[PDB]
Amino acid sequence: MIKNEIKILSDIEHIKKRSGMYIGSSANEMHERFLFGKWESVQYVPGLVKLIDEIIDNSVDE
Amino acid sequence: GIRTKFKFANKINVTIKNNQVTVEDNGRGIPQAMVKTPTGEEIPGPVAAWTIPKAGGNFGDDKERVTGGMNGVGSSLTNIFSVMFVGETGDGQNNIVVRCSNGMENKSWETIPGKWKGTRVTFIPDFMSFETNELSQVYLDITLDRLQTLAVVYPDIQFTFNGKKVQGNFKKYARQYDEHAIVQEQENCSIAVGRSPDGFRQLTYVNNIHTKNGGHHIDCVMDDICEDLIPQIKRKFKIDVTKARVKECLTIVMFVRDMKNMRFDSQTKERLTSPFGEIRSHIQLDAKKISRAILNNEAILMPIIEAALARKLAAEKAAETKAAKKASKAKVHKHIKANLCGKDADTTLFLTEGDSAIGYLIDVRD
Amino acid sequence: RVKECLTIVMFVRDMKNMRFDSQTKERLTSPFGEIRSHIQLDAKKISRAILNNEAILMPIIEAALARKLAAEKAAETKAAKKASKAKVHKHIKANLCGKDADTTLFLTEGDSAIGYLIDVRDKELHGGYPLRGKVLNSWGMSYADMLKNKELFDICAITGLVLGEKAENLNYHNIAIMTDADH
Amino acid sequence: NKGFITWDDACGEHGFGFKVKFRKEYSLSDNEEERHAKIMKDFGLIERRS
DNA sequence: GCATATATATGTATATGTATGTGTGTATATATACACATATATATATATAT
DNA sequence: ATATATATATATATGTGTATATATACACACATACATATACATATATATGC
Numbered sequence A: 001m002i003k004n005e006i007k008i009l010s011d012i013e014h015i016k017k018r019s020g021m022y023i024g025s026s027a028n029e030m031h032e033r034f035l036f037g038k039w040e041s042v043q044y045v046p047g048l049v050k051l052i053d054e055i056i057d058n059s060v061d062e
Numbered sequence B: 001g002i003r004t005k006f007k008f009a010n011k012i013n014v015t016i017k018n019n020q021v022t023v024e025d026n027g028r029g030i031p032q033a034m035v036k037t038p039t040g041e042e043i044p045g046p047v048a049a050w051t052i053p054k055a056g057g058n059f060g061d062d063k064e065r066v067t068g069g070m071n072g073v074g075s076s077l078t079n080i081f082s083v084m085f086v087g088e089t090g091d092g093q094n095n096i097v098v099r100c101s102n103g104m105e106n107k108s109w110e111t112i113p114g115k116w117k118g119t120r121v122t123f124i125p126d127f128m129s130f131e132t133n134e135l136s137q138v139y140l141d142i143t144l145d146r147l148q149t150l151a152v153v154y155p156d157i158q159f160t161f162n163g164k165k166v167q168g169n170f171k172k173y174a175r176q177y178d179e180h181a182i183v184q185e186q187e188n189c190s191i192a193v194g195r196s197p198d199g200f201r202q203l204t205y206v207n208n209i210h211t212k213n214g215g216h217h218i219d220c221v222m223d224d225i226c227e228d229l230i231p232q233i234k235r236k237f238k239i240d241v242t243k244a245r246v247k248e249c250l251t252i253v254m255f256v257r258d259m260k261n262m263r264f265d266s267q268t269k270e271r272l273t274s275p276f277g278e279i280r281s282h283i284q285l286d287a288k289k290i291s292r293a294i295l296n297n298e299a300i301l302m303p304i305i306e307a308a309l310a311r312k313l314a315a316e317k318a319a320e321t322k323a324a325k326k327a328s329k330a331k332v333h334k335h336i337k338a339n340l341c342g343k344d345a346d347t348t349l350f351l352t353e354g355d356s357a358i359g360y361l362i363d364v365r366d
Numbered sequence C: 001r002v003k004e005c006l007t008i009v010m011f012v013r014d015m016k017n018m019r020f021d022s023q024t025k026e027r028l029t030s031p032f033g034e035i036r037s038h039i040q041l042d043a044k045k046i047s048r049a050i051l052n053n054e055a056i057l058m059p060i061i062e063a064a065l066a067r068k069l070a071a072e073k074a075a076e077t078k079a080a081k082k083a084s085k086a087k088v089h090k091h092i093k094a095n096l097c098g099k100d101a102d103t104t105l106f107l108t109e110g111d112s113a114i115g116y117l118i119d120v121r122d123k124e125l126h127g128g129y130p131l132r133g134k135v136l137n138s139w140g141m142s143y144a145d146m147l148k149n150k151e152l153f154d155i156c157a158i159t160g161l162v163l164g165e166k167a168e169n170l171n172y173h174n175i176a177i178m179t180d181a182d183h
Numbered sequence D: 001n002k003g004f005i006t007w008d009d010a011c012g013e014h015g016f017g018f019k020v021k022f023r024k025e026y027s028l029s030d031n032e033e034e035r036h037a038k039i040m041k042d043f044g045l046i047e048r049r050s
Numbered sequence E: 001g002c003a004t005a006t007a008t009a010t011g012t013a014t015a016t017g018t019a020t021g022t023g024t025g026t027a028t029a030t031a032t033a034c035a036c037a038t039a040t041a042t043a044t045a046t047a048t049a050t
Numbered sequence F: 001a002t003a004t005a006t007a008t009a010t011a012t013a014t015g016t017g018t019a020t021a022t023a024t025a026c027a028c029a030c031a032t033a034c035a036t037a038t039a040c041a042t043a044t045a046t047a048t049g050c
């Protein structure tokens, strides 16, 4: 029997347990990306790129 | 249904009529036991599940959790965008009614002695924030097709829509896409390969989730299929056809059951972003059998072969070069030409109907 | 099919109410009225500029003509090609042709002889076909080169005779050859 | 080439003699005036001229 | 438990409006594919040779 | 070890014959049909109404 106990979390614990909706993809995957104008097959983690881009877009918004 | 190993919630009534959705299952029940808020307020079980978000029974271990729910915000999100929301829960000893209204700004929980065992969620959606006013027939058709696909994935759960039973078989569902679709069923996977003549088509299900934008799973399955098919078509017809050119003519209807540690990039769960080692270990699909079965078929691969040689013959037929002083651009066999025609001059063209009436012309003209 | 051959670079500035489906903000789900009001891009002149451009349009034309070859190549029904035309238009098909009788074929010369052939023949046994002009040098010739002319092939088509083997399946039993009475 | 008729020749001193075996999936009307109207509609034996 | 009523869905039958004639020759031109032979020609395939 | 000298059956082509076919404009004023759709009646049925 699967244990189903209703647990209520704060902001930090719900982000850290459910990181997928908040930083997007958190696994190393292969896509096809325009780097330097070239449609090249890259393989990376989009979470770290998004993690830098949050600060980058905050500075551009400033 | 999964958390009781399909003994309970084995019938699911999804009735959508007059902008009102009633989903009733005979599960064991949302628990009456005491759960605690971090704020200190003592709130009972189903009302804390159905009013405040970030609450639910999927915050435990993730590697053994085979259910489609992770976030604990979903049915509360259903409560938020509904003008009327009643949840009637029976655990076998009591009936807990959680009634919310005015966009969950009114909420009240109540307990009646009773003997039902199941869950009934009856809600009328709010239309003030959505860009619609009524539930039209396309929404009911999408819901009925989803219940058909879920009955294909889970034949033990008897899904009913508006009091009408739904039979789900992978064979009739696969021939609904293409009647020559090659099927392959496993203990957790079920894949059908057909034809896509006007673009690329796909449909995939991880457990009970419609991940319409994809994931790592379809990429790994098409990689394992093309890793066997591409040297096979290279030895069969000696043609250099790429992975994407083979893949875009295929419609792939693959079904994944009993996944572990499923991760999704959004709340809507449309892209399975689990690590590729996890999906590659979980999925035991035999790609070489699908490769030989679509090789031996003449109705899918051989159309790609004849279309590719049609492209190459159309490329080979387009051959052109230059000519030394072309006469009157596109000239004619019987067309005699003035030698200063085309340049800046007053040159005249002659129109007659007789070949006898031009054999005198070439001497007497300029 | 037209727009799959283009790499399109869009840069949008000073957009208003940029609604997104996700935290990553990869899909702008703002309504098309607000974006159509905000984007003032004149796509007609871009269509005219790729109209005047040639090395984008020529892959579109070549892929389009190959697509129409793949489209109207694989179509139609009743693919039972053994006789596209029953006998010849000029041929007089006998009523007991193809079965065991004394079914006789007439190889006349000239289609202007077709007058009165149908009228007082045997409708069940007699049949006819007019030949054309004069005949090739068929002596000691390869089969592939004699097969490429229609007027000798139809004789081996209207009747199940094949050049490589004997005659067993004669649609016309007797072959009556009549030629012109002159030289 | 519709699976209804199979025609053959029965001419002689007069032309236009066609012996037609109708097929079993084509309906023969027991109403003979409806048979006459339908054979005029389909076979077109009445040519009208002004 | 039974009256009932009307609603819409599909036969159906006609009545629309077109669409294709070809009519039936006159008229205008043009094209086609074979058999009959020597006479060049040409172009490229093989030998050899150091 | 391939460049070249050379030889020989391919391509018109002549005229005579002997036979085919084909794109069109003309125009009524109908002829046959090509679907065709379309609106409306009525049936049943079932689910409401009682």
Ligand SMILES: Nc1ncnc2c1ncn2[C@@H]1O[C@H](COP(=O)(O)OP(=O)(O)NP(=O)(O)O)[C@@H](O)[C@H]1O
Pocket: A004, A006, B023, B027, B030, B049, B050, B055, B056, B057, B058, B068, B069, B070, B071, B072, B073, B074, B075, B076, B077, B119, B121, B267
């Ligand atoms: N109709 C229902 N049937 C079964 N369990 C339900 C139902 N409604 C709510 N629950 C449970 O009540 C709790 C509330 O969690 P909920 O808000 O639904 O998020 P979730 O199930 O994790 N979906 P999501 O947030 O999108 O990942 C969970 O334990 C649910 O399984």
